[PDB]
């Protein structure tokens with residue numbers, strides 16, 4: 001009669017909360033989805049071993065089309081867990097699943113875990129200064145999406161930072177790198193000429209957040225566009241005007257050039 | 266020797282990540298602060314029992330003025346942990362403490378935990394649609410803060426949601442309720458008259474996120490301003506223009522008036 005939405009956190013199998021782990025262990029059935037994002041620092045086997053339960057992985061279609069036929073039936077007469085990378089319900093499509101549960105007469109509870117949305121605090125950038133978020137999508141065929149560029153423009157002109165989630169080919173475990181994202185933005189700039197993203201733009205790259213050794217780097221595009229930030233996942237941030245305290249953290253912790261203390265504050 | 270900043274999460278001691286618990290358990294000295302937020306579902310005793318170590322609680326003054334004299338000295342020859350509610354670097358000024366650590370020759374690491382900043386996803390509002398955030402601060406004497414009102418205006422103008430962290434006075438055990446926040450906003454509205462926050466404004470209240478049964482309510486200020494949302498902590502959200510699915514969740518899950526289902530595109 002109960003469905004638990006449990007977040008797995010940022011990077012590896014230990015990023016789940018003690019609460020989520022203990023509840024997961026007592027559930028009769030455990031499902032999981034790895035299409036909204038991936039857990040790059042672990043494997044399904046390591047997660048299974050930690051929880052001590054078989055993990056039934058579900059595809060985007062299984063969830064979007066058949067959640068009520070695959071998960072809810074069992075949740076009706078058993079305690080069921082639905083694991084998701086990060087924090088449950090951050091992914092836009094997750095919330096609606098709680099309505100399906102209600103419609104099926106199934107109780108649902110949410111067990112939170114760290115999300116990249118809040119983990120970016122490790123960049124030294126003030127969380128309240130982040131504006132609207134966006135996703136940099138790979139251009140495909142005759143389709144070249146560019147809305148993420150406008151998001152940066154609108155946030156930056158208000159002195160706000162822009163968090164850019166990078167595209168992922170979940171089914172192929174292929175992550176877009178911050179380098180590729182920078183190349184794409186420079187390409188959109190050349191097409192829109194809004195003076196939003198150029199070689200002189202200050203950016204921040206956060207790689208493998210959650211890991212004990214994430215890569216945190218800040219600098220101008222011209223210098224970071226070909227830098228190696230390590231293994232995925234990568235997150236790209238285009239900060240707005242900085243508070244001196246943010247700038248000093250970027251210089252001391254993220255290796256930003258001293259120049260940002262006078263150009264971007 | 267090392268210094269770990271470890272988040273304890275949203276509500277109780279089990280909101281810490283498995284990673285954070287594993288590391289905290291093996292540290293030589295454990296410090297913590299409980300003035301940046303309120304964990305309504307636990308006690309110092311239960312947290313101490315979980316990590317198996319005595320926890321030295323520090324006041325805001327101990328931290329801001331003497332972190333380098335109380336904590337860092339030990340981190341030079343021992344493994345030290347510094348615990349905080351939620352995520353240690355979200356809506357706090359703790360990031361600056363990493364700079365103090367560096368200058369003291371002490372390496373520091375960050376272990377994330379569930380944060381209210383991302384937990385708001387449980388309200389059904391799309392996380393990417395949240396704009397700049399703000400804090401509703403208790404007026405002090407003749408000084409009446411109002412910057413948060415302008416933030417709401419700026420976000421709403423762009424169709425974005427506004428997350429409003431509510432004030433806290435730990436040493437005085439004062440935790441601002443959503444009701445008090447609403448009263449303050451109505452007063453600012455009478456003073457500025459921007460039509461930003463009135464009795465007809467739709468708002469969302471999230472109380473005690475992290476617990477299994479948090480209070481999630483949506484409705485007009487006129488109706489919720491005197492409603493009992495339970496014990497603190499509380500957070501208030503002023504949604505921008507709603508997507509149809511957001512409206513559906515607010516009605517089905519947060520008990521919002523069915524009339525909001527009719528979005529004015």
Ligand SMILES: Nc1ncnc2c1ncn2[C@@H]1O[C@H](CSCC[C@H](N)C(=O)O)[C@@H](O)[C@H]1O
Pocket residue numbers: 275276301302303350351352353354355356357379380381382429430431432433471472473474475498499500501
């Ligand atoms: N469990 C919870 N439920 C509702 N609001 C919460 C909350 N935890 C924190 N807040 C809100 O945030 C304020 C503290 S701001 C510090 C937040 C913390 N670093 C984090 O990551 O969550 C509180 O006064 C309250 O308004």
